[PDB]
Ligand binder design. Structure first.
Ligand SMILES: [Br-]
Ligand SMILES: [Cl-]
Ligand SMILES: [Cl-]
Ligand SMILES: [Cl-]
Ligand SMILES: [Cl-]
Ligand SMILES: [Cl-]
Ligand code: NA
Ligand SMILES: [Re]
Ligand SMILES: [Re]
Ligand SMILES: [Re]
Ligand SMILES: [Re]
Ligand SMILES: [Re]
Ligand SMILES: [Re]
Length: 129
């Protein structure tokens, strides 16, 4: 599913991401924009053989199991395929674990490089929330 901006903001808010670990909703929408272009089915294979999955491009080296990333962990205790669903529950629950692990949203390189320090409120501007 390719979400619209405001639609994703509302869903992320229903799923408890607004101000989660202190990160306002716009940070999460911005991250999703630049990680996946709001496409829940986005995948990206990395040169190390791990793969990134879903709206927030969560990586199989640490967070989910895809059966083809040797020596990896599955710290979110999910199949990576769950991160591709039109329902964002699995991606949100895993993202909550990732953002709590020490480095905040810097865990998403695209967030650090394209959202951090910017007017992220613009991503939710005008949306019915
Ligand atoms: Br609902
Ligand atoms: Cl947009
Ligand atoms: Cl915001
Ligand atoms: Cl594996
Ligand atoms: Cl394969
Ligand atoms: Cl699995
Ligand atoms: Na894994
Ligand atoms: Re909803
Ligand atoms: Re909010
Ligand atoms: Re690995
Ligand atoms: Re943080
Ligand atoms: Re701001
Ligand atoms: Re809401």
């Amino acid at each position: 599913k390719v979400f619209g901006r405001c639609e994703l903001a509302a869903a992320m808010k229903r799923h408890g991401l607004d101000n989660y670990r202190g990160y306002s909703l716009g940070n999460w929408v911005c991250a999703a924009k630049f990680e996946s272009n709001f496409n829940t089915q986005a995948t990206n294979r990395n040169t190390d053989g791990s793969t990134d999955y879903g709206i927030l491009q969560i990586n199989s080296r640490w967070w989910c199991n895809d059966g083809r990333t040797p020596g990896s962990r599955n710290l979110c205790n999910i199949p990576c395929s769950a991160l591709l669903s039109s329902d964002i529950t699995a991606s949100v629950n895993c993202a909550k674990k990732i953002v709590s692990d020490g480095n905040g949203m810097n865990a998403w390189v695209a967030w650090r490089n394209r959202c951090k320090g910017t007017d992220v409120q613009a991503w939710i501007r005008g949306c019915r929330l």
